[model samples]
Target chain A: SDLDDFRGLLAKAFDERVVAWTAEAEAQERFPRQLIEHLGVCGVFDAKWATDARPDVGKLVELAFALGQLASAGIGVGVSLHDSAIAILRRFGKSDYLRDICDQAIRGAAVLCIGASEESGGSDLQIVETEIRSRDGGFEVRGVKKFVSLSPIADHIMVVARSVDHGNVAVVAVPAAQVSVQTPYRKVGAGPLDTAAVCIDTWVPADALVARAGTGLAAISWGLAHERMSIAGQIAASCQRAIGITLARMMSRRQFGQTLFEHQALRLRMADLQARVDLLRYALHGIAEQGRLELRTAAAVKVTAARLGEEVISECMHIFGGAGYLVDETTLGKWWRDMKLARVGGGTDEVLWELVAAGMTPDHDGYAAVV
Target chain B: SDLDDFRGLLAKAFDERVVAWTAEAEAQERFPRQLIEHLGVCGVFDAKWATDARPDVGKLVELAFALGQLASAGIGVGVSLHDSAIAILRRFGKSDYLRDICDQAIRGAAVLCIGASEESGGSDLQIVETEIRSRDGGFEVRGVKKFVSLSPIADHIMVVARSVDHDPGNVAVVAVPAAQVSVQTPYRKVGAGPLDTAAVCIDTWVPADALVARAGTGLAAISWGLAHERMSIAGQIAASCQRAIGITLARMMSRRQFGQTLFEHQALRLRMADLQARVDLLRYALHGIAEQGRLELRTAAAVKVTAARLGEEVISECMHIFGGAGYLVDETTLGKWWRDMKLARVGGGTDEVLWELVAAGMTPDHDGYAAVV
Candidate 1:
């Protein structure tokens, strides 16, 4: 309870009055720079970033703040990626230029985006098409990254590329000016987030390297723990929003001579959805209460929450009927469309289940206590 | 020895020269009409349709066997849908004109295509935009049908439309000549790349005999045959699952990591077991449901939904097993099947729509087994 007001600050900044300001961009399905910058200026990112330096703060604080925004996928995804970058950067850091970039990113003066999924081997994090080559003095990052969020409006970008000459995944930082964003993916949902394929053919100084080459999975795994937590929170909050929206619609709309809420079938489905969301929320909270965001727990929560999130939003959409499907109607449609990314983009269900499956292997003594 | 060798006959034709032709067609993103016609001329469809005839129950297993062996969605989906038109006509056709058309379709001399989905609303059947109006001493079928599976290469297209100047309940079916219909350029999709799915615009006049059934009988006729149609779709999906699993199993033997073949992993083995269990359940459910004679909406819905979902799950997991090669279309057919398998869920009816139907007829006494102590 001893406190900071990051939750209150984020809620006020991303509240309806301000999120509505991106309506034009949301209509054209373009990224909103001002809204992203607004989050930065409000000190919205420190909750996840300061975890490494400050003993009192950690993943739970930013996760709580992420849910508090109850934000659109356009904004929530940006926050999720930026949080991953922040967690990874502070996990290992230190030149003056790096310190300045962090300062600007924390204050909202700069927007940072990460590139991981590539054209050839998506979700296969190890098989990168993007290759970093040792050139005259520094490294030239050359490869095309696909389905990247915020690349169109970033001040800096963290790219995952195989260091061909040196042979490990090189986490290279390139200024946005040096990289070119092209061929935007017109998505099924999440309008205000601009996602596109970016072609990177830039040279950067030796100091630009953060996670050293060939040491792979260390820097990736550290940032990944925070990402899964934030993603779980993102879906959990959206589920709550979808439930509330449906509650209002179900109560207001009448069918077969009675209100929809009066029907046992409709009411029971709503009851079941509420219970599912509540169960996932409590699980995340209990995980957070452990005071650590470990890979096993984070993986489990993400797998559970992603499946539950899709069920809640889609069931809410069906419950809302055809009108609810209209983009102009309630948040149910947008939420249904937006929440699907949790399964495909981060860790696919197969990949996530494998992670959980790995922990359960008999040889490891991993699940001895739990089992 | 127990039966005719239709599966062996169809397998040879499909896997041989016909299958090889798809490489060029797939490269151009063009519909392979001749290869489809080749399947027809080779009597591959006799398992579902006929060089001869039998009870649909016997025919369904034969259809399922052929679809699995064909191992191509474009060919399998095309055959399954044409079988729908064939099934509906077999149950309902009588006139010499309709019979002649059926004869053409049966021989693969003329391709048969159906129009059910439209723009603005898909899977929401009642919201059709196409209208059949009685005009100029005959009926003129007007408006557009989208995502039609074989519209670009069909000789006849059966359209579902609401009758103009008639009651809303008079949803009618009219078989119009494809010559009178305009085919739009097909859009590229993630899966089923070889299937020619394009919108057909109708402004054609047809003689009164074009009516497949009485007015207001369209929904019932189509609905009656829908169980059969989905049965065929589920059959195809089951075969898809078999092929994907087979491909994945081969990979487990060859793919090595950490000095062991991936087959050494218990998790992979158990996952395969789960996939195999689901596929087996689907095959017997199809066999049992077919054995019961008349297909109920509930079991058909259950079968199709389970098979579609199972096929999708199997294909995606197999892709993961295939690793980066799974995402690459060139290395394995798994990626294409991965994309192709998704359409089954939304094709005849969405998974949600079928589940609602299953829910619509729910009873505590269902199977009288689940709740038993």
Candidate 2:
């Protein structure tokens, strides 16, 4: 019941200012943190998430579908990273620092971005170059993190670094003051979230270490899984919206002696789009029902979502034709431009497929019990 | 909730007698009436289905999956056709005659079959050559009906015919008793061996009260029934593909090859994931729509088309994964399922027909899509 109410309020919030505000942010090529600020001020981010022992997959999926209405998929990429940091700290056993950050998160005062990729892509964690060595009873982060989203504005960057003393990888909540943003790269799409290469050559107190000092990726496997699942929800929602805008155009626009909807080929394509949207939504719901998304099935979902979302939205843009070519006229064009990050941001399509294939083998258990 | 329990019990019944009995039926190339007898005696057909004002789409979906597991898809084809006639009779104001038929349906004493296809392949309803004329307070049907499944063993056959006296193009469906109609030999086919499909020769008179719908409105009534039928078949195929995927995975995960189980091979595993992905999508899509109660013909057609594709194509991949074991007709789990998957596409309005239906009902679409997103 509360989830329903939350979605209602969020959609209302979307109509109120998110639509226009996100549009303006897209046009300006700046991060739409104002969407986060406004939502946080309205206590929209004030979830009981911090109190839960484990992340509730269903609730997170519901939240994603609602928040996914912003003009760009980057909203989830930006906001969920912040949510992930707080959630990780709280779930592992909260600290005074966690409380302060949680409050900051509620007010949108503290933004978090992940800095996992060193030289190798974020998917392969073994080749991490960033080093976290013990110093002054705290930690020293040495080396650079690339494609750290929101690095320019983020308060804390959760940097995945290999500890030289321990010889094991760890995730440290490195504050952005010490973590210098070197270059803000110009990207092709997903405009609302700012991406930059950040250099981390500073030290932090020992309390900064989060999620398994000895076995970091292992410790936060569930976090990664949730991130993947949440990404699917976001793509599903975005594709759904793309289908909606295209559908209205098809029904209204007249074509060769009839509406586009009357055309067999177009309607066939539309039917495929509708099924794809429903399939992903329903698949996510199935994953959600299990109370946890195993990394295996979660990867499959993310891959399917990326494949379907790009295919669906691009078709929607093509359907919109000349009107879709223009940026400001419709959200369809914006979604088409921004949805590409679904493949790159969370994990690339190739990596996720290999992850899914890896799950099928004996390396891990049957990624899922089979639905 | 009820469907879960229903599917559980039906699976039990399937494992108990359906497997061996259905295999025997298929081996003999005959209608598996014993499968119906087994389920009926267990009060399996004793569903409040007859009493419900409208067919519970979810229940029908669950039933199709369980019933679909028989050695052939024909079990669902034959059984659900009978079930549809009963549901239709029970829904639209059952008379004394209807009560008798519904009672027989519950007891497995009567088998109802449809006789819709004539010149057309049952997809086009407009070109029926069968003529139904009023004769001595009854109706005389004067044309042969082709591809009438289960007509040989059926107690009654529902015939779709042109009502000549009403007006031109006035179609009517009549519930003609088996005694009043002659049947040809069942078609010798490669798939759905247990389905006893035959031609119904009707130079017979059916009581006027046997008319299921008014002459002019028969098209609407028959269309409603077929939509439900197509929808039920879609669920069946979706479930069939689910079973196929599960079975395929079970084999791949256990069967060893090249110093590792088949599942360890990336080449095979990725393809398996692809199959599983499509099946789960279609399965859940069926669940979502089934829970909505009211069926959309286009949505039904869409799922039908996709499920047919998966049933044939996905299972074909699974067959290769199984190697020689999947090819053998011994015992009828994989081989029979592989063979019968074809019936879903052809029997329940071929993909071409469904695409047309899906196109027609897609307008004014996405009522919830725009606002929710």
Candidate 3:
């Protein structure tokens, strides 16, 4: 019952604003201003207190659903990153920082983004070129952040800069304005809607540092669970859209003297794609309801959904033949372009399997120390 | 044994000429000069005469295999249509017409193409709008044909037009010269490459006495045999390449992320494309021995093969389980382009109810069609 309520709330939130907001923008590169206003009014920034105070499984599921739905809608990079930052700040940032950032993010006035990747090293924290040295009263954040989604438009970037110690190194965040955002190069998908390449050199205030000192590993590990869940939701949403589009196309187009839907082969294919999405829906819904999404299951969902979405959507486009490839507004190419991102981003298919293997075999309780 | 010998000669001759000739030209859109020379020297034009020293399967299979190999190897459309026209004329034209055309075609002096489609009619012959009326000695040909493949460059256009009589309508192939021929804007494939589009127009009078086949029932009967059969071969060849490409990509590009090939998913999907091709090949081989290339069996093979190749090739192109898409040199895209031709080409799928007829009516002597020993 609680899970249903959570699901219902997520559906309501998605339908009311999140889906229309991000989908309209992400699919067409248009900013979802009204959708942003609706989310701001929801004051969802309090997820940290609500989850911390309650830690109720139902409430946890609700939080996961809300995050998943928003991610599924796939809005501007700045806005999604800002949302993720609110989650992180609520869970890990200092109480004062959490209150300020979350309130600002909630009001849609400020945005937060993660700047973990580096110029030389992989996105892995161990290689962060940026140094976050302890200062007299605070800390100084310095480093080049690579592939910062939405960092160009953010008020603050959760910079994963290196913080040296006797044992090993860690990461910390700082104000992005103090950091310079570089080359807004064209990428394959999620077109330029405020995403940027960030270069940070100026001293970031020590007060801007997120999490306990040397606690970046824990924060990332925790954040990944949310990220994986969120990505899984994106894949599901893509699959759902593909099914809807294919069904509509099948019913409309005619090849030979017969309609596409009348063709036995196409009809069978449509049924198969829908069936696969339904199966994946059950898998992802389980993860959402259980409040404990396994990295392996989430990985499976990611891999499965991505794989199916590619085939299903391609088939959807095929049903339209020449018309499908020629038009950008058709959303077929956009859906396909966006689907390619699912396979590579948030840990590639290559990374997901290794994560799953480690999760299945490892004796430790947490994720394989962030590669 | 004779047929085997014929097949062997076809392979040897084409391997030497078509494959060798088009390999360089197609990559650059150059004319297949050497192939034309070989076709002439080898008397490929006269191969239709069983008595000709070049006794063979009427240049049909040879043409099919040659063009297929060329296409399979990613040859250009210009070269393919040239060979297709040569083959068709060799098989169906008058001896004098065939001899003259073959002389020029073989000498590399002229290229030929067949244009059967009409402006407002389906490529299907039943919808033909062009027709031939009996004139002084022969007949006057008049019709506007659309989507004529290679019409712009064709030296001769064999137009399949319609003619009506007191009883019913019939179809006629009026051979019109390049000088008399006119063309509309060429059509383009939606996604594939290097295809020129043009329409065919012939309003002049041609001697109907020199027509390729008898009017009325001839187009129907010829199409019934040729359409699906060519498609069947095309399908087989397309499937073979598609399978090779996909399997290669899968075998090479697949990595062990968690100690498993990506192809080995729990829910596997190896979809259609070449079932018709497979069936075509199976029937082709079977009919080669059992039926000795009877018209009926040959027609069946054509339909089956076209269907098979369509499915096999498309599936391989879409999902490179072999991982060739990113690595191979424009090969995947080339494959896609070739497929665009497959869809529009007459041989994509079998004509309606032919497969149904063959399926329900394959018997010993249904219509005095006897088995070959």
Candidate 4:
């Protein structure tokens, strides 16, 4: 119970600071350094690593949930990428690396990023090509990884590498100075979150490898599933805000000789949109509870959440009409841009549906297997 | 079957012309000049009165349906309003007016605008403020009516006037010089079209009194119920256009991420857009026909149809996000604007719920017995 108090306090404190964190993210397209330090200092980042009397999974899920809520409040995707690297380091890093640096990451003195994705640029890890050749006592790693989220300022780039000795895969928490991060690109919504393309060519000491070379695939996959869920949570938040704002607008705006809400036609439309939001939220809750979420189900959540965000936000804008588009103060115009990214980001609506279809059937292309 | 072929060919010709008309209307925001003249030459407006074996009601429905199809192709609201007014004149006007004025109207030499509305504007004729008082020789009428569609360009303004004696309401068809007709204002659309405010004014009149009036409350209800279906037909055109555009856009854009057709979104958001279109069309077809043929139904078909078009068009615009903010073009954007304003034209005309309820009740208001419904 005492520990629960601490946990509760920790969550409240983390949430309180998200207001400022959001402003920083919105302006810079990246989280503020002070906020990152605050999170680490509060033991927010380390709370998820299980202690003697606690399981790590529950703590991580809670953190993910909080991060999702913060993002819904307009914190950018930078928080998730930052949290993810910390998650991997806590889970799979070598003891020596963890002893020297993991505490530093938690204390907000440093940041973590993982270069898992490569030129092909997908969520999968098995197809990774960054090979690690054994040197005298260590290993020489060489390969290019694309879309390195949180890589530029990341103190440790946990390079997901494959070893040639026994043809196994592992992670190397390469420091920023040792690895190379290229010029970052600005995306539609996530902005300048430094989703850089990394080119790695440095020696990874024996202690740098996190997991055994061959076994990193499962770890990366597991981490990715959480990331997708986190993204879904962000979507749900936007949908909720959109619905809330639209309903208020509909009740207030009068047009064509009646209050906009009085029109039975528009009312029916509102009902359908609300129904979609409810359906997607239920699906996402199911994914959170499932022992191992079916990727297809996760995909559906993304598709639905993204769809709902776009639909509801547009309707909200409709209630305001020309005013909504012309004014950024309503946040509607900005939210409109953000809602569109939902369809394109995360897994994308098209890809999610395809993944969903594959999950429902056996031997479907791009699917390894499904439970 | 041979008759069907004749009807089908006639309908096909009209439909083909409507597509061009819609495109022109979309461009001008008003009825296209050439298209209007050509339609007059075809006697498209006068078909109901031609006596050329009297075009069947099905023929009229086809015209209305064609208007919708053309609207889907982006035809302006001017075409349908022009057609709707002619339909009204042919059905309700006395013979002399039908030949002299209505015939010319149908012939496209003139245009007819019905002022079924008065101050606190609605379909209820008794609510009419225009007093047609008896004078030394004839009668002079003075009052205001709002929301008569095509008033600015129309050759004549039809005012519903009430006689002082016995409270009988008369529908007065007043001819005004084009210069005499004054535009109160112009209405603009988000999609940009050439639709003027339905409200206009006419002051001078002549000796001939072709009094089109009703005896009591019930007649007003009957007239309103019949007129709304025509409005529903107009609404259907708007709904169809919105639907067609939503489907076309969805099919054209490819989902590049997984290389699957975007149609696979099971919630069928694309189809949802189409479904909204279908809903409006169904309401219009069912209501427009019954209303046009004077099949008196208690349910307000006009109000429902207007709601449907407004609903469907707006929804389609919402679903069309790919073109970003510029997406209105794909949904027969010009036609939608014209049709939407038309839907709201003659405000409280088909939407006169209070009057319709009183007229439908058939009971006296407590005093003396005037007459039974």
Candidate 5:
């Protein structure tokens, strides 16, 4: 009953409300506050990290598929990231530290964000220069993180700062008010997340430390697998919606005395895209069934899904013809903008490709060591 | 003495002459007449259908790999086309037809070409407008074939023409001396300026021997010869990819960027490794497919698609690695390889069509249409 109920509610809400607000939300370059609260009220935020029986990943993916229909509204990234942060905290946060903010996040009273990447680091997570000094009964984090998603509006930011100890790192959950958040640059897509440069020079209680003092990188690395898996789900659903929207257009639109759908070339291309989407869906399903994936396997799937999503959405735009060119006027343009974020965010395709290579290369015994 | 000596000879031959000739041949936009005969002298022509004990498919591929090193020399397509013609003649030609030109072709005295593709028909062989009329005992073929490689120099051309009575087709081994062969156009680049196409409108005197009547319309059916041709194409392609990587490695080693040699970049190294792995997989796939014998058709189709696609991708990456210099035809020969690699996809069949065929072959519901080994 719960699964069916959530499905029914997501469909109705996405159709009745989310579809209409998409343009204004993208134009204003922000997630609709009311829609966020509506999603929260519908129990969307709890499914990812509820203390009760956890929802099946398959079911969550189905809900994601439904919400994806309204993805033109640019809320999927913001909403998915909210769940992502909660899941990370649930899995890696020290119970004592999580107790303070977990319930608020679960209830959607306090939205969450992560501070991992930095100005000079790009996607090289190991090269960050953020300073975390051990202070009296706590730690003082002094660092600026670039591309911190939702940092501008988040209630809590999980800050990853390099500690004084050699090759050690610290993960601190800093309250939003304690950090200076600046919107330094505007991005072409995924604008609803309100990504900003976050600089924190504040002290947190010793309890604010997640997992352990020197283990933050490990904790963050562990959580990255989950986050990427979630991103895969979002990309998969987004591609499916692209197919659906484009198929509808091709069926109704007439060109050269025939419906666009009747063209064999377009039909063949669509079949190819559908096959790709089906393959990626099964890949994600396999990962879910196997629980945690090796980093290489995760990277490979992410690379395939992200590249496929971009290609499929671009092809769909082709079917839309001239209407696809207008950035503010077309949903296709918006999806194209959003689709690019998948390649650059989480981990860039280049970095992931390298990770896969490392995973494939053999160790002393000629066996591939997990990367 | 056979394989090793040939391998060493090829390495020395490609190094001494082929490398330097790539640019001049490409710049002038013409096939190297002296070079074609030079390759023939190197026993390149003899390896496939020489009068002595002939090399099997494996040895042929090995030879293809050796010729691949000289791939930058811009003769891969010409050399491959030559072998392709011989192989086709051997398989489908009547004994009488083979006797006419087999020795001349094997000795490299006569270059051969094929007339299959038509002007407007992109790759749809069935839609060819080439007409073959059953006339005066022999057949009279009247049609213009597009993209006929080596037609300018080829002493013989295998012409495929459709018949009128009940939609059958015939493959005619027409001597270039007999046909009105005119070099219409030379393609832009796969080499310096190789690939000459001709227009043929000629009639031959009576003799049923030259026409492949038993093969029927199937003779004109490209699929019959495609498996072997694709394998040859695959070997050529794998060699091209290897050459590209070799060129990229040289460029990366000498070029300095980011305070280090370009090869030091993790991204570039990883890309190189990935391309290497892809090339190896396709090489193994081709060998495995050849060993199976029966599944060669579908497997050859798959390997061709995979190898050609991989070769193109790897060459493009090689271009990216070289930047502006790579785009110049003379500097690294990367751009030429990149341009030539595209023909692999379109020449055999479009990648999309091949993919569909593979899908159809794998599908059980098709009830073994493709099930015949």
Candidate 6:
């Protein structure tokens, strides 16, 4: 009953807000702050930090899936980042700081973003050169993080850095005002999710250090396991939604005295694509129930979800024919662009495949910097 | 140097014999007997079983790839069936009987066909109802093998049947003339390709030494044949996909849409690029697996699943680009390619079966069905 209520709320908000403003938002390169707040107020953010002694993983996944199926890519990305930021901060931040951030985030007073990658070392976190030196009563953090989503809009960033003392990694919560955000670059998709490079040159008190200096990698690794699962869930939902849209169009679009779905070839192809998406969704549920994230299972989920998203979206484009390429007529083009990010974002599919391969064989030349 | 020589010979023969007859052959539902003879004489059959020593895997794969790239879907299937029969016979047939069969097969006096599937069950080789009863001195094979390629045309059918004594499976190479062969049905796309059903009720009087009397467990030995059969499908799909890519590129260049050449559109261009890259990756995967000379069941299954999936997608996208032209059999061969690609998944084990094989191999003790079904 709660999920039904939540679903209705998400749909109402999506039709009235996300669908109406996505185009204007993309044109102006602005994140949909209002939509995020609307979702937050509806207990969407509370799913992560609610006081329930036994949280419902199934309910959380259902909510995430509903958001993905209903919202535009812009809203989907913003909600994902908002949810991930809350989960990551709650795990690593000091009690007082965590409480304060949660209080602001729940009310839409601020948004949180992950600052992990650097220009020098793309996704290889070990190669991150950002240094956090113990200075005065706190720490001085300096480095440039690349492709930090919500950097231009967020109120705080969880910056992953190397400790100067022990040469170990650490994470620090830096206020947005203290970091210099570069001008946002135009991306091919997810236009409303503002992304920019962030340069940090600021000092923070001792309380700003989320987890102790040497424990950054451990904390970050812990956080990534959850981040990847959430991403896989969202991608699966997005693919299912695309399939629904394409199926509706096929039922109406006529060609040669028959609707497009009347063709056996197109019908079978769509069935095959839907089969793969369902498998991936089932695999995600398995990942969620596993007490803690197993690297091999987590990687497999991400790889399957990302690859299937690209494939499903491509088929949807073909089903729509020429109209699929236009931006305004159908959101297929935007979804197509958004699907491309699935392969590169959370972790490259190649790297994930290598991770899965290592678990299967003893002859692996290891690739994971953290594991 | 050996590979180069083999490559040149293949190209020459492919251009002269295969390319010359494929269109006419497919149009008529006739097997290209002359090309089979020419290829046999050129040592295509001998490459796999010419000597006691194992043939060079690399050279064999290269030859198969070249034939596939140059031949139409019909010829490709013929060559694949031909090569598979030669390999299965060499390993299972009596040495004395093997020499004669090899000689006939090489010179095109006799072509070998695999009779494995039955009407009762589709690829479950385990449920074969064909009964092989030991008679006076030889054996009497009785049952039907459905979907037998070249059944009406081949001189011999290697029928897999359950032995009357132990109810275990065994293979018998029966002379096609001695058995009751049924009339053929013409499939939609493979036209004139000689795919037919066969009913075999015959007896063979054998001397004490006969390959059919060797009597190995049919189901277990058939596993090896199926593995090799899967790789053959993978190679054929990769080559066919390459052909689709060439056709799409030419069509896009000549046809103008929306006041510009279709190739000029960014969307169409990227689609073609992705198709080409996918074909290259699948082709290399086959080459890599064959080079090792030993079958890794899981890897073989994975390669087949990925290749077939990629093949179907690439061809479908090419068809969409061609629009109404692709639907016509004459405008482009794409419609045919698209039809043939569908069989790749359903045959040689479905994608569902293959994924299970891959998963079971990846997780040694875990049964994927119970875990993720």
- Give chain A TM for each model in order: 0.90, 0.90, 0.82, 0.79, 0.88, 0.88
Rank order by DockQ, top first?
A: 2, 1, 3, 4, 5, 6
**Span of ten consecutive residues with least summed lDDT in model 5 chain A:** A362-371
Interface RMSD of predicted model 4:
10.1
Please tell me which predicted candidate would have the highest DockQ against the true structure: 2
- Scored by Cα lDDT, where does model 4 land? 0.55
Better candidate number, 1 or 6, judged by DockQ: 1
Best by TM-score: 2
For candidate 2, lDDT tens digit of each residue in A168-279? 7787788888977976777878776788888878988877777546667764555667677778888887676666667778888897799887777788787777755766
Off by over 4 Å in 3: A1-82, A95-99, A114-148, A151-156, A159-171, A174-202, A211-218, A221-224, A254-257, A322-334, A361-371, B1-90, B93-373
lDDT of 1 at B252: 92
> Each model's DockQ?
0.09, 0.29, 0.09, 0.04, 0.03, 0.02
Each candidate's fnat, listed in order, reads 0.00, 0.20, 0.00, 0.00, 0.04, 0.00
- Per-residue alpha-carbon lDDT of candidate 3 for residues B1-373, written as tens digits (9 for 90 to 100): 6556556665666665465555555454334445645655665544433443221333444455455545442243344455545545555666586557756875557766666655344434556767777778677778886655556666777677677542354766666787887886644333223344466777888765457655675475345434424533543354344444455445434543233444444322232223334435543553463344433444544444444445444433343332323212232433343333433223322333335445566566645654443
| Residue B57 error, candidate 4, Å | 26
Query: Which 10 successive residues of model 4 chain A have the least lDDT summed?
Result: A50-59
Point out where model 6 deviates above 4 Å: A1-145, A148-342, A345-371, B48-57, B168-210, B296-298, B352-373
**Residue-level lDDT for A226 in candidate 3:** 50
**lDDT (tens digit, per residue) of candidate 2 on B234-291:** 7777766666666677777878987998877888887877666666666656666765
Residue A240 in candidate 6, Cα distance off native in Å: 24
Per-candidate TM-scores read 0.71, 0.87, 0.60, 0.50, 0.53, 0.53
Give TM-scores of the second chain, every candidate: 0.90, 0.90, 0.69, 0.70, 0.84, 0.87
Candidate 6 C-alpha error for residue A348, in Å: 9.8
